[PDB]
Design a protein around this nucleic acid. Structure first.
Ligand SMILES: [Zn+2]
Lengths: 98, 112, 26, 42, 27, 19
RNA sequence: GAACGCGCGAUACUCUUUGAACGCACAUUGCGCCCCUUGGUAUUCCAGGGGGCAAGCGU
RNA sequence: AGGCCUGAUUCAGGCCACCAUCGAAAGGGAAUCCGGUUAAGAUUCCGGAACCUGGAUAUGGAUUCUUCACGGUAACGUAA
């Protein structure tokens, strides 16, 4: 005698990027320095592999300042420029002289 | 008599980008893109616009309370009043006919 | 409001029913 | 859950199942074109 | 503009319609 | 329908050889 | 072999992006999953780093 | 060709069907406006003003005797 079940299934299924690498050098053109002096915006050159989170974190770690916003663009010569606007508690000119 | 043009990437007169002309607080005419108008919800039985339900875009219904998109009656927000009334009457009459047919079958099989 | 921290053990769900089924099974 | 065993009736049932499966397979593979359905209609 | 840059060889030999390169056969 | 999916190929073949 | 950079590869007169080319796509530097770890209020959130993913009634 | 659910601990049981992917900067689609500003940048920057999406959470109110609220004949209304 064999005990086999009646209810059978209808289908059978098978059972190197740190703070010193992120920020390469600042931008010291007259427009960038004007932004530093007036708009409280530090202009930096950053690596092409860095996003806004990494740029903000790197600025915070290296320069000990609070970053309000970061706006990045890619320059025609294959390099990335970042505008970092700091919080009103910090003066960008003081950091630039430092 | 100032001429205005699109403010976005699309340069073609497609349904997606439609322009209205408005006078800004600067005293000049400027273009403004208008969104697609919302469509009233329709009854699922007769296709007439549902009464008492606000007309919004599909994703704007996720942000309003349930009273603005339903009706207190049964099937409220899905079917209109007349369709619900027909459904009730039809269901009751069908049940009554089933009872009568069952009685008739019982009688006609009771001969033997 | 002058409270006191503590850890509360919630009552198990469907305890009496499961006990009855186990009793009938055995 | 049936606690029964048959000797040759099981073989007959298995053969019938296999034949039905083959017939269904033939019908499914042949009904790929509507010309066959039209011919089978008449 | 029948051809574009080929990733494997760098030439302007990648047929856009055929999606094949007439210089190195990519892919 | 096509119910043949209830049997994998190897089961079907090994039962066909039984007959 | 190619692209981008300073003969060489971010350690640049260790080995970037690729390529038989390998997580998936690709004329996009587009889209995922898994494990460990660190930071910012932090059990939930966000991000950074490291390492990976081309059963059968047959006997 | 796969995912999910149930279970005082027994791995057992159950549900469902159907195929990757690519293909639109004129199709479908969540949300930003005004004013100012450069030698060269603007719905992107500056000033003001506002929206969308996702997340963790707290407070008030409701959930009216203690347990998922009412009104109008009706269409329907509501802070829940
Ligand atoms: Zn209706």
């Amino acid at each position: 005698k064999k005990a086999l079940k009646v209810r059978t299934s209808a289908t059978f299924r098978l059972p190197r990027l740190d703070s010193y690498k992120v920020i390469e050098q600042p931008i010291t053109s007259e427009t960038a320095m004007k932004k530093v002096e007036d708009g409280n915006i530090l202009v930096f050159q950053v690596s092409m592999k860095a996003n806004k989170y990494q740029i903000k974190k790197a600025v915070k770690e290296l320069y000990e300042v609070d970053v309000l916003k970061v706006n990045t663009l890619v320059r025609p010569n294959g390099t990335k420029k970042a505008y970092v606007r700091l919080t009103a508690d910090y003066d960008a000119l003081d950091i630039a002289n430092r | 008599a100032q001429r205005v043009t699109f403010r976005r990437r699309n340069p073609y007169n497609t349904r997606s980008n439609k322009i209205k002309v408005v006078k800004t607080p600067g005293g000049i005419l400027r273009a403004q893109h208008v969104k697609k108008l919302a469509t009233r919800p329709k009854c699922g039985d007769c296709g007439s616009a549902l009464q008492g339900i606000s007309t919004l875009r599909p994703r704007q219904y996720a942000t309003v309370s349930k009273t603005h998109k339903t009706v207190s009656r049964a099937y409220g927000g899905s079917r209109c009043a007349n369709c619900v009334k027909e459904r009730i009457i039809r269901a009751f009459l069908i049940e009554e006919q089933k009872i009568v047919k069952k009685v008739v079958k019982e009688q006609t099989e009771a001969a033997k | 409001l002058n409270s006191n921290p503590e850890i509360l053990l919630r009552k198990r769900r469907n305890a009496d029913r499961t006990r009855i089924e186990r009793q009938e099974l055995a | 859950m049936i606690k029964d065993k048959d000797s040759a009736a099981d073989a007959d049932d298995l053969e019938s199942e296999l034949n039905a499966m083959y017939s269904d397979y033939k019908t499914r593979r042949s009904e790929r074109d509507a010309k066959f359905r039209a011919k089978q209609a008449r | 503009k029948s051809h574009t840059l080929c990733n494997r060889c760098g030439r302007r030999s990648f047929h856009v319609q055929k999606k094949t390169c007439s210089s190195c056969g990519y892919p | 329908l096509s119910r043949y999916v209830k049997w994998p190929e190897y089961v079907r073949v090994q039962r066909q050889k039984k007959i």
